[PDB]
Amino acid sequence: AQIVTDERMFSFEEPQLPACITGVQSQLGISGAHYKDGKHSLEWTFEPNGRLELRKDLKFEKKDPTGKDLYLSAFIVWIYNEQPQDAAIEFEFLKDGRKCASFPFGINFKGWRAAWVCYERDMQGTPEEGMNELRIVAPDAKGRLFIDHLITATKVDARQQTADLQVPFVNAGTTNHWLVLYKHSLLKPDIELTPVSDKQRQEMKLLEKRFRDMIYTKGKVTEKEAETIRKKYDLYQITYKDGQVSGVPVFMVRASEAYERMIPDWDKDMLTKMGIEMRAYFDLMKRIAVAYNNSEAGSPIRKEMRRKFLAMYDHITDQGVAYGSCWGNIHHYGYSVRGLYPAYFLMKDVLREEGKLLEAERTLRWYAITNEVYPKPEGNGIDMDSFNTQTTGRIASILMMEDTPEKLQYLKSFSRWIDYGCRPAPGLAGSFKVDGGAFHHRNNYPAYAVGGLDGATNMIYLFSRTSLAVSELAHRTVKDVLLAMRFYCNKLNFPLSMSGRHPDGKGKLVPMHYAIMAIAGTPDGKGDFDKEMASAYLRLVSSDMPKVSNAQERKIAKRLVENGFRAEPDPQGNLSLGYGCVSVQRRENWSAVARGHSRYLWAAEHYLGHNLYGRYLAHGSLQILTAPPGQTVTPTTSGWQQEGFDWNRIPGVTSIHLPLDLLKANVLNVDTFSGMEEMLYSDEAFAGGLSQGKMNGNFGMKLHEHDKYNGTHRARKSFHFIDGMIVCLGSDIENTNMDYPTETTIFQLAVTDKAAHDYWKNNAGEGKVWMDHLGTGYYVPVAARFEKNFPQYSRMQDTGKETKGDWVSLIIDHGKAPKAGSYEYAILPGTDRKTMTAFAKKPAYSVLQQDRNAHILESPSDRITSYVLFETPQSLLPGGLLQRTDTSCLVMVRKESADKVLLTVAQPDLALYRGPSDEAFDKDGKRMERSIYSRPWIDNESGEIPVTVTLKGRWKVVETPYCKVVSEDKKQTVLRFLCKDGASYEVELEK
Ligand SMILES: [Ca+2]
Incomplete structure (x- = not known):
């Protein structure tokens, strides 16, 4: 049987030829030797310059004048050739007498070839509504062709017709x-x-x-x-x-x-x-x-x-x-x-x-x-x-x-x-x-x-x-x-x-x-x-x-x-992905992975029916992936499952706690450069990390939620990765949302097996010291709220179907619409009770400053000073060695001895474009959603940014293409770093 029966469809499955088809200086016949649909085709055996004439209303329709419908009317055929000829057939379309449109069709092939040709775009001349004749003019030579699957005219997706050797x-x-x-x-x-x-x-x-x-x-x-x-x-x-x-x-x-x-x-x-x-x-x-x-x-x-x-x-x-x-x-x-x-x-x-x-x-x-x-x-x-x-x-x-x-x-x-x-x-x-x-x-x-x-x-x-x-x-x-x-x-x-x-x-x-x-x-x-x-x-x-x-x-x-x-x-040490805005600390079998976003890099990808609630995935998240030594690390082992997961409380993030219907991504087709998708990048360039000796490092970001949702919500967050310890610092947390609270989440962990349930039966835990069922410790000096939700309700990332699970959470409660909120806590994965109590009595770090200008921190035992500098620091910087900085950047200082120092600098600004944030503004002054694909700078080389550091005392350094000593005296030593790619550049210093 032939697929699709239509008045416009010619498939030649009938014993007799259609009366509307006549042959000039040529012979016609129904053949079963070749067929593209049904079991038969039209054998057209021609003498030189012979015609095949189909006299029927072609039923061509002009394109939609309004532009609503983009489909174009097309002519469709399959031609078969047994004997290839270095020549071409001509297709002619006529109204009553005169030809209006024509197209050539090469016949230098053996077998079946198709042609889908749009009347208005692909054809020579101009098509007219009401044309009632199809001429197929043979070349100036004899030969034979088989014709099947002929549709006179039908509306077709205009994007898709493809050219080949025949057309x-x-x-x-x-x-x-x-x-x-x-x-x-x-x-x-x-x-x-x-x-x-x-x-x-x-x-x-x-x-x-x-x-x-x-x-x-x-x-x-x-x-x-x-x-x-x-x-x-x-x-x-x-x-x-x-x-x-x-x-x-x-x-x-x-x-x-x-x-x-x-x-x-x-x-x-x-x-x-x-x-x-x-x-x-x-x-x-x-x-x-x-x-x-x-x-x-x-x-x-x-x-x-x-x-x-x-x-x-x-x-x-x-x-x-x-x-x-x-x-x-x-x-x-x-x-x-x-x-x-x-x-x-x-x-x-x-x-x-x-x-x-x-x-x-x-x-x-x-x-x-x-x-x-x-x-x-x-x-x-x-x-x-x-x-x-x-x-x-x-x-x-x-x-x-x-x-x-x-x-x-x-x-x-x-x-x-x-x-x-x-x-x-x-x-x-x-x-x-x-x-x-x-x-x-x-x-x-x-x-x-x-x-x-x-x-x-x-x-x-x-x-x-x-x-x-x-x-x-x-x-x-x-x-x-x-x-x-x-x-x-x-x-x-x-x-x-x-x-x-x-x-x-x-x-x-x-x-x-x-x-x-x-x-x-x-x-x-x-x-x-x-x-x-x-x-x-x-x-x-x-x-x-x-x-x-x-x-x-x-x-x-x-x-x-x-x-x-x-x-x-x-694998041990520290990774910093400038391209991706990710920092990872690794000791023993565990890992701590930080992710943010910038004016170059989007927070989360949202499609229809995919990742509905992941708005906060890059709001300075910090996930601890862990397992008991000897077992392979899995999300399940790291205390994560999908069912029951509070999507607002992504571990580590500062975010406004919304109901799921308000947290869901309102997915739109924003411009011609994208489809049904949401990909929100910020207006801040400062987001990324540095990696010292591939071993330690820090991370810092100016968080700023897109105006599409809670646009007033901004925060300065930093991570400091020292040995087996991750210290999280935050300041300048603010929004104007008076309906729903702002929270940073220290941890959110799934409780699955029997042993996990028994661990939480009455675990207080203290105190300034917490420890979960996965063996990771939390030093929390600031006021924090603990929730034991057995069970907790949520929805699936894709389907949105209701899900539940036993979940345990520790959050830092900023108010509704905070003005200048802050937090300070540290995470030690794979630890013991003894180390934690000793850490509470004597913390291994001390905060040097924690404000809009900088988050600075030192560890005397590890001999490390960590600098997250959000702005150019007008004033003498604390620490003793690093005095001043040229421009907002990331710095880390490690002291080997009183004579030898390891200095490392990074510039989180990828610098794909140089000026103020690339933005299209509203009538009211709100940021307009534009897909990343629409931006003209997406293929730009990372721009070089000079960073000058001022150091106390005389220091000798081996010069590199990326580091040069600029000024020097008895009291100071200033160096210029040539930064790119958000990479970490380091030098060895000697007194
Ligand atoms: Ca057929």
Whole structure:
């Protein structure tokens, strides 16, 4: 049966020809030899310059004059050619006598090709409402064509029609990355052609082995697997008639958009529901290709799978999956075509034997848009989504080629593309950053990074230890990103604040990335294995020879253990992500992760039905990820679950406690640069941390909630990470909300097991000293309120459905509409009762100042002075050594002895733009919501900011490109730091 029956739809399934179709100097007939729908098509056998005339009301309708409806009326056909001709058909559309619109259609192809052409945009001339004739003018030569699936005119999503070799003129304006297969296939290389050397030929052989092993591992073909294959394959009804291939027509899902304005009950996924879509088809081909490689040479099953693969190949190529073919509409083809590339690659040698390899090679190159690899990168970094989706297809298509100089040129081009793609990207752009941050949607986004890393990681390894290897810079950048991720995840899970739009506590890092990079070798190429990567890997899969599921990962892991590699100890020290506004302190097995936001970096991503209540995720959050020594750190072990969680009381934040219906994100489409999303960045540049000797550090932020919600709410918050202690300081907390209280939350923890319930039965706890059921201590000198809510009510992050759980909370109660609120408390994770009582009697720190100007603090035992300087300090700074500062910044001083001092400085202002905050103001003076994508500075290089420090006494320093001594006398020593990227710059001082 033909899908969709309509007066405008010509499918030729009737025994007699339609009376309205007549042929001039040509013969017409119903043929069953080729068909795109039903079981028949129109055979049009023509003499030179013969016409095919369809005399019926074409039912073209002019575009909506109001502009409300953007759909354009389109003509749609499928043409079949048995004999390719270096010529073109002309399509003519006439009202009564005269032609109004026309378009050319190339016929230099074998098989089915489509054309979706919009009357108003893509056609020559001007279309008219009421035209009632279709002419198909043949070229000045004889030949034959089969016509099927002809829709005269119907309204269609105007964005989606794609150009190819048959219709290069279609949608000339578009820059849609999905639709530019033809445009970008025309691109030419700039890397010069060279012949292939013996070493280079062996290297290409090596990339193929590496790639085959990557997508495939030898296995067994079960009787069940074989029966499933036969059942799925038979439904396609692939058969041969007089040398011609036919079978059930296969479309890619979006081809349904043709019938959108045609059927009342339209379903976008109707073709998938019919088993007629491409994903299933190419999935089966992969399935069969795998089965062939898992069978003994000369066996009946191997011959059977070889036979089935080729039959499926012939049919899909006949249907139009070939070079220079885009089926009229190709948007979002990526997902349907995922199986294509591995299926064809696994079947290289057999395709060559059949004389079909060159063809196969070209179709892969076409659909992977491999020529996009030709251009010289203009800068560092590419879209994370490129690494995520474009790597597999492109590399497979290149490995399909014969060992020719053209293949080497492609390889050189591909390596160059990956190389610059991995390099530190500027601003909020690219993929990877100098400090280890990984960007997508213009912030650090682990959930997306994870997918992008798959590509980058796999391609680095593929090209590794070879003349085509990527630069040290590219290799080290990705390595550092992975090392950072291992640091801020604990053990494998993303922290809550870094969950993006999925705060479900499920997102994890991928151990594979580490194992792949371990066998990639050191970034310089001098080491066969990467030691840091290997031991990082073995920690992440440590059981507590490891146990793993994925076959190719198990192979690598076996190699690493045999080569004597052991698991990492839990990473120690301090991380500061300038790109992402995150600081992490790590001692023992625990971690403390701080996250804020700036005028460059958004607080939280809100989508429809995703992350409804996460407004406060970056309001200076501080999550403690922990577990009893010996057990793996999990959100569950760190005292977090989704059900029952008070979304207002994100650990560490200063926020106004709202009812969930008021806390929910009011998601809007704010401008043309975005969709239904909320991504709120502040108007303050001062947010970030410093990292001293990768061991300790501090964090500071000027918190300022967006005017969309509680815009009066602002605060100065700081974190000070000294050894196994995190001291939290706050001042200048203020808002004008008199309906709901402002709170900083010391901790909010889930009570799950029996032992947790028994611990809280009467635990007071004191006193100036608290200790939870997870073994972490809290020194709280200020007045604080304790809540034991068994149970506590909340809602799901996505669905909003009511959830409950047993929760325990300690909060610092600022009033309703505070004027100048403040707090001071310290967190010591993985401690004991004894240390805590001793800490209460003699705190290991002393506050030097705590106001709008600065939060300064020292620890005599650790020999450390911490400076969070919010403003230029007009006055002599406390501490004894650091006297004055040029501009608002972060400083930390460590005293080795009276003679040796370690000085470290950071400038949290990323400086993507230089002036006052980029803002669009209201009639009343409120900040207007504008999506980050709309800002013109999002790709800017981080600006250099000079920071000058004044130090007491004579000091000698070794000069660096980033640190210079400016002025010097008997009393003072001033130094100038050249700051970038929110990075931490440090120097060693000697008296
Ligand atoms: Ca038909």
